[PDB]
Chain A
Amino acid sequence: TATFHRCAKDPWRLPGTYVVVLKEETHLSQSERTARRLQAQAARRGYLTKILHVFHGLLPGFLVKMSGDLLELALKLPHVDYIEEDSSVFAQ
C-alpha cells in the first residue's frame, strides 16, 4: 500500500481534493484506467467522485474531488505511489 500526505499547516489544508501520484513509468492509459477504476470502486460503495484532471507529461497521476472516506480504497489502487491532499498556496 501507498502513503497519504497532508499539508503540515492545518489552516492551509484543502480536504476533499487529492492528487493521486502514480509510480514513475506509468503510461497515460494506465493513469486514465486507474482514475476510472477509483470512480467505479467508489460508485459501488454509494459515493460520487469527480476526476478533475489526468496528469500527462510531468507526473503520472490524476486529480480527484472525492470523500476522504475513500482514501484507504484509493491507497490500495494499482500503480499508486502516494496520494497528497490538496492545499492552499499564497501570493508572496
Chain B
Amino acid sequence: SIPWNLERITPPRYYLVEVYLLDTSIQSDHREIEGRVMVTDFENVPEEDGTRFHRQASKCDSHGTHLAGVVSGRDAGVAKGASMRSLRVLNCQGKGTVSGTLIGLEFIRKSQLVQPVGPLVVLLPLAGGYSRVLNAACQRLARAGVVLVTAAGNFRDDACLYSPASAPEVITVGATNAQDQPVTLGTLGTNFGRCVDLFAPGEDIIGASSDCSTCFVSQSGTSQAAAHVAGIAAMMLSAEPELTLAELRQRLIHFSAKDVINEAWFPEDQRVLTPNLVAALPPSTHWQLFCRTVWSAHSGPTRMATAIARCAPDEELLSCSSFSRSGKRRGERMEAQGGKLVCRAHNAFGGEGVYAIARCCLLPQANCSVHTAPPAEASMGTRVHCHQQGHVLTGCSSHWEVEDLPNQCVGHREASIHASCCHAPGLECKVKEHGIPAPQEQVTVACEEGWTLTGCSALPGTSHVLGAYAVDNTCVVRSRAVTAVAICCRSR
C-alpha cells in the first residue's frame, strides 16, 4: 500500500529543520501540507506567454504542491514533520529567471540572519543553463551553512551544463524509476556525470494534486528526485542539527543503494563519472571516516592538457589518481592551489586526454601534508615515506615527465613520487593488495567492513594500464601482472 518510492528510500532496518522550496505557487490549504507549509510574501516571476495562456484552465500550483507533498506530505511524504517555506520563483508556465532565483536565494539568507540558528534545507527543483552568478550565490549560501538540494535536469545531458545543478557545493539529484533504472522523460530523461551526487525516485511519484483539497497525482521528473533528497536531508538534520553540507553529502553517499542502476542507459563516456547511488535514509541516529570520489572534467585531447579534481573546503584530499580510456597518460600529482591540496593530472603527448580523480574525506583535527621525492633511477625504484611520528600514509601519487617508461610510496624509476601523510587522532591505515597474472579488463581490491578506502593505486609494473580509481570502498585498476593497491584507513 506504501508508494514504491518511500518504500525504496526506507532501508531494511527502519526518525526543527526548515525546508525552503523555491518553485511555483502552492496549494497551502491541501490536506497533505496544511499546517506544514508557510507561504512567504516573496514572489519574483516573469509574465506568462499570453498567446498560450488561459488563466481559467491553468492549474498554476501543480508543480510546487506536488513537490511540497513529496518533502513533508502527511500520507505520502518523505520527511513527515518538516517545516516548509514556499517561495514563488517560477510562473504558471513553470518559467523563472536567474535574477528572480538570486533575489529568492538572497531572501533565504535574509531570513537565516534574522531567525535564531537552526538547520535549513533549500530545494531548487529548477534548471537553466550554466550560470556563473547562480552558482556563486549557492556557494555563498552553502558557506553560510544552508543545505541546498537541486534537480539534475531532464535533458539526458551532462548536469555540469545547467545551473544550479553544476554548482559543486550543492546536492545534485538524478532520477531513477521503480526498477532502479534512469528515468526517461519524453525522448530525454535524467541528467548524468560528474556533477550529479546521487539519484533518487523520479518516475510515478505520488504526491498532492492541487485539483482538490484531498486528491493525489503521480508525477515524473528530476524535481521529484530532488524532493526525496530534500526530505532525507531534513530527516537527517532533524536528528543531527549541527551537520554541515559536506557532512550531510558524505552520509547521503554512504547510506545510498550502491550498484543498483543499469548504467547502460547513460552514454559510455559518462558511465564511470555518473555515480551508481540511490538515496536512502540512514537506519539510526548514529566515530567513522567518510570518503567520496571526485572525478574531474576531461583534460581535453590538447598537448599541455591538465585535469583538476578538488575537495570541499571542509574536506581533506587523502589521495589523488588518474584515468585515460586510450591508456596514454603522464601520471598525477598532489599539488596546492589557492592554499589547499588539489589532484592535478597531466595528459600524455599523443593522448586523447586524461581524468584526475580525487579522494575527499572528513577527518577532524587532521594535519595532512604532501611528501615529494624526485626519480633517482635505481633498480628498486622511486620511494617516499611519512617520517613524522603519528603521520600516516593515506595515499600515493606518481607522475613522469618522460613519454616511454611500511608507510611508504613506491613508484617508477623514471617517475617523481608524491605521498600524502596525515596526523589524526586514532587514525590507523593498512594496505590491501590484489594481483592477477594476465588481466581481462580490471583487477580489484576492496577494504573490509569497517575500513574506509582512502587510497586506490595500481602497482607500477605494467606499462599498459588505463588508470586506477576508487569506487565506494573498492580500488579498481582498468587494464585493457596487474596488481591493485588499496590504502584502507579507520578512526577509533
Q: Which residues of B contact A52 (CB under 8 A)?
A: 99
Q: Which 7 A-B pairs have the closest CB atoms?
A: A91-B94, A89-B128, A7-B129, A92-B151, A92-B223, A9-B129, A89-B96
CB of A84 within 8 A of CB of B133, answer yes
A87 touches B129 (CB 8 A): yes
| Chain B residues within 8 Å of chain A by Cβ, number | 44
Q: 19 more A-B contacts (CB under 8 A) besides A58-B137, A58-B141, A86-B99?
A: A7-B98, A7-B131, A8-B161, A12-B128, A17-B99, A21-B136, A59-B137, A59-B140, A63-B103, A87-B129, A87-B131, A89-B126, A90-B90, A90-B126, A90-B128, A91-B95, A91-B223, A92-B153, A92-B221
- A29 CB contacts on chain B under 8 angstroms: none
Report the nearest B residue to A86, measured CB to CB: B99
Contact (A92, B136) CB under 8 Å given A19-B102, A53-B103, A87-B97: no
Which of B125, B129, B154 neighbours the largest number of chain A CB atoms within 10 Å of its CB? B129
Q: Kindly list chain B residues whose C-beta atoms are within 8 Å of the C-beta of A53.
A: 99, 103
The reply on B259 being an interface residue by CB < 8 A is: no
CB-CB under 8 A from B96, the residues of chain A are 88-90
Residues of A in contact (CB 8 Å), total: 26
Decide if A91 touches B98 in the complex (CB within 8 Å).
Answer: no
Roughly how many angstroms separate A8 CA and B151 CA in the complex, as a whole number?
19
> B-facing mask of A1-26, CB < 8 A → 1, else 0?
00001011100101001010100000
Closest to A20 in B: B133
CB < 8 Å neighbour of B129 from A12, A55, A91: A12
Question: When the two chains form their complex, are residues A59 and B129 in contact, meaning their CB atoms are under 8 A apart?
Answer: no
Residue of chain B at shortest CB distance from A11: B129
User: Which single member of A12, A14, A91 contacts B24 (CB below 8 Å)?
Assistant: A91
In angstroms, Cα B136 to Cα A5, docked, is: 13
B293 contacts which chain A residues (CB < 8 A)?
Answer: none
Residues of B within 8 A of A (CB): 23-24, 46, 63, 89-90, 94-103, 105-106, 109-110, 113, 125-134, 136-137, 140-141, 151, 153-154, 161, 163, 221-223, 226
Contact yes or no, A92 B226, CB < 8 A = yes
How long is the Cα–Cα vector from A92 to B113 in the complex, in angstroms?
29
- Nearest opposing residue in chain A for B105, CB measure: A58
Task: Please state if A87 and B105 are interface contacts (CB–CB under 8 Å).
Answer: no
Chain A residues near B131 (CB-CB < 8 A): 7, 84, 87
By a CB distance below 8 angstroms, the chain A residues around B132 are 5, 82, 84
Is A46 positioned at the interface, with any CB of B under 8 Å from its CB?
Answer: no
Contacts of B221 in A (CB 8 A): 92
**CA–CA, A56 and B109, complex, Å:** 10
Report the separation of the CA atoms of residues A40 and B132 in the bound assembly, to the nearest whole angstrom: 28
On A, residues with C-beta under 8 Å from B are 5, 7-9, 12, 14, 17, 19, 21, 52-53, 55-59, 63, 82, 84, 86-92
B130 is contacted by which of A8, A17, A19 (Cβ under 8 Å)? A8
Could you show 21 A-B contacts with beta carbons less than 8 Å apart? A8-B161, A9-B129, A19-B133, A53-B103, A57-B113, A58-B102, A58-B137, A58-B141, A59-B140, A63-B99, A82-B132, A84-B132, A87-B129, A87-B131, A89-B95, A89-B97, A90-B128, A91-B125, A92-B151, A92-B221, A92-B226
Query: How many angstroms from the CA of A82 to the CA of B135 in the assembled complex?
Result: 14
B98–A55 CB distance below 8 A? no
> By the criterion CB–CB under 8 Å, are B106 and A55 in contact?
yes
Shortest A25–chain B CB gap in Å is 13
Are A57 and B110 in contact (CB-based, < 8 A)? yes
- Bound together, the chains give a CA A82 to CA B64 distance in angstroms of 33
CB pair B140 A91 closer than 8 Å: no
Compute how far the CA of A58 lies from the CA of B144 in the bound complex, rounded to whole angstroms: 10
Expressed in whole angstroms, the minimum distance between the Cβ of B475 and any Cβ of chain A is 36
Query: Most chain-B CB neighbours within 10 Å: which of A9, A14, A57, A63?
Result: A57
What residue in chain B is nearest A63 (Cβ atoms)?
B99
CB distance B106 to A14 under 8 Å? no
> Which of B102, B110, B161, B221 is the most central at the interface, judged by chain A CB atoms within 10 Å of its CB?
B102
For A9, A58, A89, A92, which residue has the most chain B Cβ atoms within 10 angstroms? Answer: A92
Q: What chain B residues lie within 8 Å of A7 (beta carbons)? A: 98, 128-131
Are B97 and A92 in contact (CB-based, < 8 A)?
A: no
- Please state if A84 and B126 are interface contacts (CB–CB under 8 Å): no
- Docked Cα-Cα span, A86 to B101, in Å, equals 11
CA distance A32 to B390 in the complex (A): 53
Residues of A within 8 A of B223 (CB): 91-92
| Complex alpha-carbon distance, A82 and B99, angstroms | 15
CB of A57 within 8 A of CB of B95, answer no
- CB neighbours (8 Å) of B95 from chain A are 88-91
The chain A residue with its CB closest to the CB of B101 is: A89
A2 to chain B, nearest CB (A): 12
State how many angstroms separate the Cβ of B250 from the closest Cβ of chain A.
Answer: 25
Minimum CB–CB distance for B192 against chain A, Å: 14
Q: Establish whether residues A89 and B90, one from each chain, have CB atoms under 8 Å apart when the complex forms.
A: yes
Closest to B22 in A: A89
How close is B491's CB to chain A, nearest CB, in angstroms?
A: 36
In the assembly, what is the distance between CA of A27 and CA of B378, in Å? 59
Q: In the complex, which residue of chain B has the Cβ closest to the Cβ of A53? A: B103
B35 shortest CB reach to chain A, Å? 25
Residues of A with C-beta under 8 A to B94: 90-91
Q: Are B126 and A92 in contact (CB under 8 A)?
A: yes
Give the residue of B90, B98, B100, B105 whose beta carbon is less than 8 angstroms from that of A84.
Answer: B98
